[PDB]
Amino acid sequence: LDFLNEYPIILLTGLLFLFTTIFSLICLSYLGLYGVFILNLASILLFWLSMLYYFNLIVSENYYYYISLGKWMYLSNGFRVSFDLLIDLTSISFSFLTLTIGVFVYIYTFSYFRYEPLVERLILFLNSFMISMILLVSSGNFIVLFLGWELIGLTSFFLINFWSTRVGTLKAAFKAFSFNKLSDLFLFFAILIIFSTTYNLDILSFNNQIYLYESYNIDMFYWSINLIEIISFFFISCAFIKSAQFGAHIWLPDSMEAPVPASALIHSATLVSAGIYLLLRLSPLFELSKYAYFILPLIGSVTAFYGGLVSAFQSDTKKTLAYSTISHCGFLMVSYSTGVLEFVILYLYVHGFFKAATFLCVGNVNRFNRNIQDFKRMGGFYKYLPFECLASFVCMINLSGLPLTLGFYIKHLLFIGLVESYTLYPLIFSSLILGAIAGVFYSYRLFYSIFFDTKKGKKAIYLQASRIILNSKFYSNTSLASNLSITFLVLISYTVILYLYCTTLNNYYSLSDLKSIYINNAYSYFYKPDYNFLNAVSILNWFVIILLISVIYLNWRWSYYYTKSIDSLSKFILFSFFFFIFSKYIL
């Protein structure tokens, strides 16, 4: 209907979600467990349906909305700011991912914390965090952006430190609190500089008149610093702290004692993506900045390598996922440094969806293992959590970027557009290559050690989960709702990623305008690649193949199948050679 296209209902449904969350928080005695669950489920489902309707219009067609709620605050003599929301491609790209992951995490969170005394508090905290993140990405001016920035930091401080009776979790939450205070300082100083320069806080206007101030300088006490350089420096600093780049990443692994739905939301999109959003929100500023040009690829590649290698050595499942998230944040920073804004969105969506699904599977495994998150005390879990095993296999083969999967394409697109003109290019490229191959190691380690190793766990788990009296059609080591949530999340992820791939990677370009005038020749090597580039990518392909052979055929222990393992490796090599000969030359 044309009325829906002219007047969005996203605002109405989001307000319904927010007000239901707040009133459930205040009137929690009237609503029991079931009442809170049902009310917030209805609100979140309506919000998701409305945003799903508008997703196609905003992404494919050139639809966007500027909504003003009213004049809000006086910030200068004779100056007032209003509460503005900008529902455009950049905002909807983050908001739809956050809302979908949040809907499925919400349904999963009731099965998780099944008999805990404070399920309602966790549900409402997750709702508050999602609302804050959605408000952050839908900002219309800088004041609303700062409000969302401070809200995501505050609500994540409560999802962390959920076990408020322990000071040990209080320390972990306070670490992130301090890092968020530093982020807020940097962002607010950058906003102050912007307002002192242009005397406006509207983002859109800022994106269209900042090029007029490229040749300007500011006078620090003994320095004359370019305006774009200092503004970009502060924005990049706060983005680095939120996105947990190297050095400022130490708060993120210590954030893992939060409940696993909170980890699924925080580490997949939302918080870790917030910094990336900033880079996408203010693209011209960083296009005109020398500091960004030098610092994004170097720090991104170092972070990618560091996170990828540290992840492959972890034994805690949540720590492995957290370090994988750090590596992927570095990869996203490099992808933004590429200069192609579509590749960033594709990487964001793929990583967020599959990382959230992997967190859900890991959370079910951890609940089965009775709060022991180290897979040194696991093994042979396939017969007790079969759905977890199979769904986890799918999610890890997609997340690790294995060949012939959806996650392969984002890595390939990243390596297509990499700029070779950097002074520190050798280090950047080596770090990127070493971080790209690390996914197979931690994916294989996690899957094999949790599900298909020897029994390393305690006898109580296995023996109590296998008594004869428990044989029934109702037998299960998880909940049906968890299985349905994971299944539907995977299906929706596949559908959305395929739709985005069609929109961006087809011969007919269909994506809406990204409001950026910096265009490079990166798509050429995607559209008309040449021979040396194909050979160069084949090199990394064969490196990954060698690593897969290593993780499959290496015997680190004595076994009755050692000799037969060597024989099978020899048979596979000979068969591959003969198969290649037959497929290439004769018939």
Binding site: S196, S215, N226, I228, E287, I519, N521, A522, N535, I539
Partner: protein
């Protein structure tokens, strides 16, 4: 491995690059006050500097040189094919 031919779209030279140089061509930040107040943009802590020649300018110059090189390569290839045709037509 051999380095690739990476740069901006050679058909968009009057776009991103053109505006950057046009900003320096039009020293608009140092024009006289529209009210005639005996002040200019140079009388501020945040002031224009139209003779700077640093920062991102080296990257812009490198991009321009790369675009020129790619255009020269294309022109050389076209001249080569023309020369081949006029040489073969002689025989």
């Amino acid at each position: 491995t051999t380095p690739r031919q990476l740069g901006i779209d050679t058909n968009d030279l009057k776009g991103f690059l053109g505006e950057y140089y046009g900003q320096y061509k039009k020293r608009s930040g140092i024009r006289s006050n529209f009210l005639g107040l005996d002040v200019t943009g140079e009388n501020s802590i945040i002031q224009p500097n139209y003779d700077r020649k640093n920062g991102i300018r080296d990257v812009i110059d490198s991009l321009n040189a790369d675009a020129g090189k790619r255009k020269l390569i294309n022109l050389e290839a076209k001249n080569f094919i023309e020369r081949v045709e006029k040489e073969c037509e002689q025989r």
